[PDB]
Design a protein around this ligand. Structure first.
Ligand SMILES: NC(=O)NCCC(=O)O
Ligand SMILES: [Zn+2]
Ligand SMILES: [Zn+2]
Ligand SMILES: [Zn+2]
Lengths: 412, 412
């Protein structure tokens, strides 16, 4: 508790990095493996080397900035996130975890603290998945989720592959991607949701990450005149789609407290006010921390959709387009985060990460958990994404002590 | 006198020729009001009318008046006409049949060298469908004094373009004042857009009434947030609200069977991202009934259900009724003239209430007016498979021809 971070220095680094790719709306547009992403990586690498770090890059472009330990070859305690952003990205998504880890190294240097295990800060390539799909591809390769050839062959809209662009910006590293043991892993991140702010809690002790299932549904009925078409004989595709929306809501509430169910996207055809809609495309978003429950939500959706379609007379195309496994983070790492919050007197609570992060894939090959701070209005993936300096400072203090606790564990 | 008849083949071919302008792959027409395709159809009709000896004027709402001179130069005209614009999923007969049928009336009179006491006019009414700019029948509404010219010209499409702007763009911003000119009589020929005449094996529908309508625009405002990290108890989903109003609207219609009509045809979800709870949804409501009191009961149920749905979720509501006209009883003498024409030709006929709104519904307020119906295949309209046989098309034009001659040969 005598060891604390320099909040102003960390805050200034975030304000500085937000200028690289700054958008007119006040956000950051630093797409993965662009010249702007190269600029942000190079600046972070420069700051890390100035703090005495040795830097390596792996074959997926992941950056490892290492602070030596007493046992130089012991498994590292690592932190990290992503430095790339969405086209409408905020100033704290991803970059906070990277710069928060940089501040951890600097604070340890300032207090002359030597750790048993070495400490690393990591930048993961293309977490956002916007310029290249899928998201989190590089931490996926590291964790064995994807093959290396798959990761390097992902193309953007212009046909450029990740491997080509890594070579172009000088981040085609020589270190093999994955297979290197890690003692512990932590990812510091803004919540991207409203829980911590609404409850006036400073730290979210992330215990789990949600599993996901994404769907695309099209109902096909018959477009017809809104007036003289008799009501019983109508095949209204929006009437069906509206009832699935309500069903999706019911399915989410039936699996509280952590179940999530949303219909976010809908397209009505022909979308003329005096035409019965003949076709409606829409999406379904399911999330739950338990995989077995999540599959029950899938079964209930498929069963309810077929029922709604049969009662009206609609044709149905239903496809699951995405699946993401639920993650239970490592208890020892979770306890280190909880104790760090406690030592500082930061009001905290256990929280499930509603979105996916590189920590979710990393958790499959290394003991991992996450640290959450609140964000203003729960806003993320928007240029107006915001957090207070006190929130920013508090999460870095928890990350500092969570890492120091596990990095000072004697080498068994 | 039945020896005066229309040229069924010539009228049919004019319909097939117009169907090329905006032809869709399924065999319908996509010729939205005040588009370049709508302009093309207008120019072709004007050219055919001029070839038939008509003088053509265009008024301030873009209405086209094709005039056949009479013996009495100052007499009030007997007018017929419909609309040349279509739905996005429009058929080949909705609206255009009434225009081309009137053109065939002028040609048939020329073929038999018939001179009438009153002048005869065939009219194209602007943006009758009310799809691209809302509401329906706005141009005939301004003509009848129901709406002001400023209201008619300020109606906007989804891109903010007004009727007045688009009239100027396609060269149909006329100089003649809209309305204020006396009419001796008015008749509109149209397909039923319903199944009654086909089901009863009747050739002519003697339109005695048209049901009243009420159109609404509703915007629900909730809270846009990420579908993942936002827990279900903290949501204000605007699409959940709109979905329940769609079902409520369907319920209100079934509660007033057999003639109640209720539809949600248009919806716009914001931001419409699959992993974002919708924060705002705009949508429309279409209510119809032949009894004004029942139509008002449907209105009360809608406003009550909307407020209840909105309060249960936490949504803000903007609800505007943007269109309302009471049920119309057409002029008895004009109805009887239609009935008598069908009798003279031996066309099996029946009295019928119009399920859709037509420009004749507004014209009936300033001039003696009624309509002639022919059946359509499977009763379907506002679908590209909308169909009518050449026999139906020919028979309705013969009724229009003799109904119009009934009033046009009346001496001043
Ligand atoms: N042409 C036509 O279908 N009528 C438009 C007005 C209405 O929807 O009743
Ligand atoms: Zn992130
Ligand atoms: Zn029509
Ligand atoms: Zn229509």
């Amino acid at each position: 508790p005598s060891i604390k971070v320099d909040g102003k220095r960390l805050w200034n680094s975030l304000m500085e990095m937000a200028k690289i790719g700054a958008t007119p709306k006040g956000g950051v547009c630093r797409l993965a493996l662009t010249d702007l992403d190269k600029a942000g990586r190079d600046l972070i690498v420069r700051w890390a080397k100035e703090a005495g770090c040795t830097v390596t890059v792996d074959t997926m472009g992941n950056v490892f900035m290492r602070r030596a330990g007493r046992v130089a070859d012991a498994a590292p305690v690592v932190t990290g996130s992503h430095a790339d952003s969405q086209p409408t990205g905020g100033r704290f998504d991803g970059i906070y975890g990277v710069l928060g880890g940089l501040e951890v190294i600097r604070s340890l240097n300032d207090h002359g603290i030597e750790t048993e295990h070495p400490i690393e800060v990591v930048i993961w390539t293309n977490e956002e998945g916007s310029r290249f799909a899928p998201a989190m591809v590089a931490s996926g390769v590291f964790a064995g989720v994807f093959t290396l050839e798959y990761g390097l062959s992902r193309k953007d809209v212009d046909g450029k592959t990740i491997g080509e662009e890594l070579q172009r910006i000088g981040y085609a590293g020589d270190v093999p991607c994955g297979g290197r043991p890690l003692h512990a892993a932590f990812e510091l991140h803004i919540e991207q949701g409203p829980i911590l702010e609404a409850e006036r809690k400073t730290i979210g002790v992330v215990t789990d990450a949600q599993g996901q299932r994404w769907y695309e549904i099209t109902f096909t009925g018959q477009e017809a005149h809104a007036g003289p078409t008799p009501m019983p004989r109508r095949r209204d595709a929006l009437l069906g789609a509206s009832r699935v929306v309500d069903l999706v809501n019911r399915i989410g509430l039936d699996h509280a407290p952590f179940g999530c169910a949303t219909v976010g996207m809908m397209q009505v055809h022909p979308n003329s006010r005096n035409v019965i809609p003949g076709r409606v495309f829409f999406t379904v978003d399911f999330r739950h921390p338990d995989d077995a429950v999540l599959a029950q939500m899938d079964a209930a959706l498929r069963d309810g959709v077929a029922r709604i379609a049969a009662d009206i007379g609609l044709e149905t195309a239903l496809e699951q387009i995405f699946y993401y496994k639920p993650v239970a983070f490592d208890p020892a790492c979770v306890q280190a985060v909880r104790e760090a919050a406690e030592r500082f007197g930061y009001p905290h609570r256990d929280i499930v990460s509603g979105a996916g992060h590189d920590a979710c894939y990393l958790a499959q090959v290394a003991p991992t958990s996450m640290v959450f701070v609140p964000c203003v209005d729960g806003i993320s993936h928007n240029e107006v994404e915001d957090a207070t300096p006190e929130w920013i400072e508090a999460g870095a203090n928890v990350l500092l002590h969570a890492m120091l606790s596990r990095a000072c564990e004697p080498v068994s």
